[PDB]
Design a protein around this ligand. Sequence first.
Ligand SMILES: NC(=O)C1=CN([C@@H]2O[C@H](COP(=O)(O)OP(=O)(O)OC[C@H]3O[C@@H](n4cnc5c(N)ncnc54)[C@H](O)[C@@H]3O)[C@@H](O)[C@H]2O)C=CC1
Ligand SMILES: NC(=O)C1=CN([C@@H]2O[C@H](COP(=O)(O)OP(=O)(O)OC[C@H]3O[C@@H](n4cnc5c(N)ncnc54)[C@H](O)[C@@H]3O)[C@@H](O)[C@H]2O)C=CC1
Ligand SMILES: NC(=O)C1=CN([C@@H]2O[C@H](COP(=O)(O)OP(=O)(O)OC[C@H]3O[C@@H](n4cnc5c(N)ncnc54)[C@H](O)[C@@H]3O)[C@@H](O)[C@H]2O)C=CC1
Ligand SMILES: NC(=O)C1=CN([C@@H]2O[C@H](COP(=O)(O)OP(=O)(O)OC[C@H]3O[C@@H](n4cnc5c(N)ncnc54)[C@H](O)[C@@H]3O)[C@@H](O)[C@H]2O)C=CC1
Lengths: 371, 371, 371, 371
Amino acid sequence: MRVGIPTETKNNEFRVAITPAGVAELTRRGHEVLIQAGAGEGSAITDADFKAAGAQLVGTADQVWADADLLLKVKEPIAAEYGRLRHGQILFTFLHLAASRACTDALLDSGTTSIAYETVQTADGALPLLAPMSEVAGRLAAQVGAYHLMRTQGGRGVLMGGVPGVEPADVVVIGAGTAGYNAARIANGMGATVTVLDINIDKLRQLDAEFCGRIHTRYSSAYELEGAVKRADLVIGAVLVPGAKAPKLVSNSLVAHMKPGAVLVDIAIDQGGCFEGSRPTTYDHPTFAVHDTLFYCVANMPASVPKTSTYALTNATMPYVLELADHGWRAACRSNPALAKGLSTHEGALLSERVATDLGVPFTEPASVLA
Amino acid sequence: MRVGIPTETKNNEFRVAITPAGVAELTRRGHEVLIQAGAGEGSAITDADFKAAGAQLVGTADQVWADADLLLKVKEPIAAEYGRLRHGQILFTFLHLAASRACTDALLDSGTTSIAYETVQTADGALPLLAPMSEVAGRLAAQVGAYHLMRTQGGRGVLMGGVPGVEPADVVVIGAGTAGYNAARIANGMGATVTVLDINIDKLRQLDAEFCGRIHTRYSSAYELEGAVKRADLVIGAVLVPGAKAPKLVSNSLVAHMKPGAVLVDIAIDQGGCFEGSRPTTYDHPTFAVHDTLFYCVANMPASVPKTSTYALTNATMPYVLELADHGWRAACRSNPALAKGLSTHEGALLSERVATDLGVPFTEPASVLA
Amino acid sequence: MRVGIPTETKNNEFRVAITPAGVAELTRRGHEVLIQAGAGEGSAITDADFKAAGAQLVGTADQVWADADLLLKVKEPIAAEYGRLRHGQILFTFLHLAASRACTDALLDSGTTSIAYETVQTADGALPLLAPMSEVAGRLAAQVGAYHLMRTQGGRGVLMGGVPGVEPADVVVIGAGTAGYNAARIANGMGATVTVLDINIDKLRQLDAEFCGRIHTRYSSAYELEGAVKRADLVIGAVLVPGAKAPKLVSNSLVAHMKPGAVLVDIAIDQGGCFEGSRPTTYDHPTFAVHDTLFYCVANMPASVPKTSTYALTNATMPYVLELADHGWRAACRSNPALAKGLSTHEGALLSERVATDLGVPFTEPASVLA
Amino acid sequence: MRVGIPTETKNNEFRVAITPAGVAELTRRGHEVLIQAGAGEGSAITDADFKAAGAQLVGTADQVWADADLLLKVKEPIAAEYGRLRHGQILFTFLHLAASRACTDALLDSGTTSIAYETVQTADGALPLLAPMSEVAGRLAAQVGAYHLMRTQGGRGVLMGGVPGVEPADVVVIGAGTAGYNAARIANGMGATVTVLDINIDKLRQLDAEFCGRIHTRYSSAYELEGAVKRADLVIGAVLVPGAKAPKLVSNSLVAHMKPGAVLVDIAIDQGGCFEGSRPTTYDHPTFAVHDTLFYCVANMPASVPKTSTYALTNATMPYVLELADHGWRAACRSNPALAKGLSTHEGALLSERVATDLGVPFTEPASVLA
Ligand SMILES: NC(=O)C1=CN([C@@H]2O[C@H](COP(=O)(O)OP(=O)(O)OC[C@H]3O[C@@H](n4cnc5c(N)ncnc54)[C@H](O)[C@@H]3O)[C@@H](O)[C@H]2O)C=CC1
Ligand SMILES: NC(=O)C1=CN([C@@H]2O[C@H](COP(=O)(O)OP(=O)(O)OC[C@H]3O[C@@H](n4cnc5c(N)ncnc54)[C@H](O)[C@@H]3O)[C@@H](O)[C@H]2O)C=CC1
Ligand SMILES: NC(=O)C1=CN([C@@H]2O[C@H](COP(=O)(O)OP(=O)(O)OC[C@H]3O[C@@H](n4cnc5c(N)ncnc54)[C@H](O)[C@@H]3O)[C@@H](O)[C@H]2O)C=CC1
Ligand SMILES: NC(=O)C1=CN([C@@H]2O[C@H](COP(=O)(O)OP(=O)(O)OC[C@H]3O[C@@H](n4cnc5c(N)ncnc54)[C@H](O)[C@@H]3O)[C@@H](O)[C@H]2O)C=CC1
């Protein structure tokens, strides 16, 4: 089939959904690979690199979208792309539909078949395509939080690790999953005192063992959470219920009681944000004031480190890309339950129960479109 | 005597040279403490906090300077302050004279008595007043280097620590002293691959043992230095010869051979810079381009984390401040050889041999003005 | 000469001042070794073990004391032993004279020559005979503090290390020297959050590097000390000025503000105690109440682990014992400045300036009795 | 329904089965919470704290027991409570029935419905309600073992971690599960040389990886076990077969060959003890002599650290408490197989096969009382 990769268009989005190695393997398998001129430049993959791997370089986005049987992207379609969505095409990308009625409607109205990276899910419950991006975003949260704690950025003016004889920053991570663990690990490595909260005690045990208690763990009761947040210099929101809109765990009322110049990084912004005061920001304007604190709410954090994140992502997605190209969506999803869990839309039907619930929109069973 | 502390005026300088506790101890000893209204605000020390500790709050900088027998500052006098320097007054602050003929001339022409924090030196050869700032600056270099490696900042677009299956950043630290050790430690904590060079093998042996080889050490031969720099995503320049202009270790020719978007942080900029291409930048405009790389050359790095660095600095300086106030410069320096090594100017005479050599200016023996 | 070792008589004192190996080395050098029957039993060294090494086992303490030219002990003479002190005899033991006018007077009135283990001091300033006992006492403070934190012991009822999801104990160590470092290390190993204070920043810098920030370090300002103590579940007092009465750093007023059931272990009790409320306790009755807290003030902590501490002590003391036996006190002290610093009394003259100052008693120069 | 929490009555039992937060959530759900006056005081939860959360404070235990539909406790009913057990009430607490015919009979004769915390078991085989108490007891075993190794407690007189140049204690842990891992981790953190035995090699691999071999692992053959025990200063028994009486792994004959003053802590005492010589002790009298060793056999170890263990326990139990209150035992157990595995008695029927086998008492299938 024809596999198309357009240039990402979200603000400062430097990632691309395929590398030369993936192009070469698709072509080895009898597929036609179409790629918009310039699509890999953010990730230092020249048109010439893609050409040598076997891609057809096309001048415009409209052609990639029109010609592709399988359209591969990194981020969700944005408003200017809603018109490019079409019936009879497979879209494979991060979707975050529980967080956007407008995006969901556009997919449904177009009749396109869409599969979300972030709801592809193996039998152990893991999300193998979200995981590498959660790892990137977690590590970035720590480095971005430390930078914004500087007085010159409007922060409290506290050094992450302190220096001998002087207290370090107090960092609170909400969620001990992939992003939270990665945020905690880097923040701890920068010398901050790190506390991680979760409602899953198993995850806290795992963190306790891995750092031998150097990273503090607190069960996420209302009392522990509020107490930790009030004391924090930096809060990193990293909770998830797979495919769902993030729960609102930190109220604006709580934020009003925080130390002046504290920083809050809402990693969960891609699913709507786990802070009440969150709204999406971009790399051009990443922060805004809430009460006397600074919120950071970038829904495409890994975009700033494309040399790392393009590869991390495609190492994970490629086996799934190959099965979709070889067999088409129905046969691929039929053969792979994990893949099938990423199914989101098809011919105006919404195939995710959690998305349908969060948006208040009718749900149709995926088994129905697969049988 | 009268101990005066004016507001710092260098760009984005949020530190202050004393805290309420130091003010209280000075007043307990019969000293008059004069402080410019607003001087502690960058460090979250209000005029009211200084007042309660015993300070006289004065409206203008000119008064502090005119009235103080001992003038305490954080950074060197800048141009607009040259007219405030006076004969009969002791100035105790960071000076960096080997890096500024203009500052040195101003001190000499004023006839003031000046002692440099950074050349106060104990008999083991350590610089106890520079050390905590070198600790701050080293830790900041890692976090600031990581941030500027982001594509959105003009950098290469590589995450410090990578993620599983994908390479981390390659970090090179030149100098294994206080600043370099701290930069290496934080960069390593962020998951970067860190290589540290020095000409002092003892210092490399210490780093090797502390991290049991996780931080790489290379003797600083031309071959090792050039090779490490060409491979680096981030270079941190942290060399020092006490009180001297920094040696130029990284040529612009070498920089032309580096990877595009690499970042170079010149911590040694306060002493003139150890990179050939270095020139001082400010927190307002911290970076500039050299060839295809980004240089970061801020001479007052600890200013951005004043809640940490004001205290770190004053924990160290205060015992020296108390000796100078109790006994005056001559008797304090007679009693304390370490203090006496900080002696820089007195009545138009330049008292540092290393500074005199570097600037091409007459040297006068400090034992002569202490006899 | 005759080297005598009596049985220790302080409460629960299970240590002994020599082992079979030391006895054998003394006898190899032509010395007569006299040991009280039963002296080694606390340390599991039977009379038969000492006999086989060459010792003369004697039935009574009075004989050991009467016959010995060099008398080796572990702890200071107590009241019932004051009548055994004699002119012409060398006493070599822990003395702690700055803490006991009564002990000092007894030594002075007897005219005996005494050398204190704890003031023997090498040119680097280290106290090589105190050090291994400080190591023992520091490690014990952590384990004894943890035990007394149990509700069943009157303490707050908090587990040292917490468990995943639940806060650990907050431990504050005052003094970053041998005892404090060892207390911090063990407390941290038990999973407590440990903060260590000192006025010597060099020592904090060393702790910071050794644990890469896992043990918190705070410069010991009034503000940091008071704040840390109010938050603490367990406080360990481990400060020292060599040969001096301990400074009083924790007021009873501060103790009144602590959490109910907090535990305070005063390791510095042997030198008078660094807590205002401290008074010496014994292993039989180790604790007492101050306000709503529990104080632990045992002046012979290493006695409880004699299998460890007898050997640790004698590994260190023996080379000094051999010098004193071979050459006598005057020539040994003439040859070894470190040994000479332990000189405490001789023929009614007090030879330590620090002790003399603390007790308000005339000082006589040790160079005078060595000339 | 009515949820009742009486004061614990076992010796020195300071835990309570609910906290204010749990009370508040039960009341939010339409349940009536009854709590005996004083029940939370051991855990520093005042009657006023429980009152503010919504509980009815009742004067006597008899009323709590009579009125409660769901009775929540920490420990098993003791003799003086056997008369309070009633038909038509759900009891949810630690039971340890395989270790007490008398307790089992009382439950059976009363006709009450009982569910054991310690046999609630998820599909991975884990025991999520036992786990936090195993974590507490393991960590306590190390600290309690170290204390009793002191000569002043009748132990060998060896310091847990030794000091430089002198050997540390030799610690042997039997069982590499939750309690054993926690005991090993703390003992290692105190500087002891730790060896852990198990028949499950997977658990030994996990320990080997987590400490990179610093904690020794030995397959639990008769040879390795006997050899390790004879060499040990401290033995910690931490084996379990879920719901079963502990196997007797250390014979009195073996104990006769141990070093004099060795300490044995039998954590498995709650299930009957894994040492042949074990019998339950209390916090009032925790130890007794076997041959020349000291046995410690406290069946309610976490009771001494209630500020830690009350919260650890209730963080785990609460989701199960809520389901029992909302739906009653039959529907809750029907919906939750893990919960259903804790089913122990109902109307005179014993529902645990392992308990019935160990006691030699008839077994009835749980599916029979659930269908
Ligand atoms: N902003 C960005 O650019 C990126 C955002 N993300 C987002 O980061 C978030 C976290 O992702 P992962 O770490 O991979 O998820 P994960 O599933 O590995 O971890 C989520 C954790 O949150 C915990 N949790 C859920 N509800 C909670 C509550 N009410 N209180 C406390 N803890 C709670 C869960 O128990 C779980 O341990 C997701 O929204 C993900 O989409 C991921 C990559 C990039
Ligand atoms: N930009 C800023 O705001 C601040 C800058 N600094 C500066 O950082 C610099 C480093 O200071 P510290 O780490 O405290 O000094 P340090 O004396 O502790 O270490 C300097 C190291 O550089 C090494 N070195 C000297 N010449 C060398 C050569 N040719 N090649 C390789 N290594 C060489 C030395 O052997 C020494 O180990 C100084 O200029 C200091 O003033 C310090 C604080 C703040
Ligand atoms: N109770 C017992 O059985 C034993 C008690 N000790 C005692 O433990 C105490 C500590 O001994 P080491 O650790 O060997 O001494 P050390 O000399 O190694 O360390 C003492 C530390 O206290 C610090 N210090 C002094 N004054 C201070 C102040 N005002 N505030 C904060 N820190 C201050 C010093 O800077 C130094 O780092 C001594 O009194 C020693 O005799 C030692 C062994 C056994
Ligand atoms: N005394 C007290 O206050 C408390 C006692 N406990 C008890 O501690 C004991 C251990 O609990 P957990 O660590 O949670 O259990 P677990 O199931 O996590 O670990 C038990 C380990 O024992 C091993 N084992 C079983 N039979 C063995 C044999 N014959 N030889 C060698 N190893 C063997 C298993 O393979 C397993 O790894 C249980 O009896 C538990 O009820 C728990 C909490 C408090």
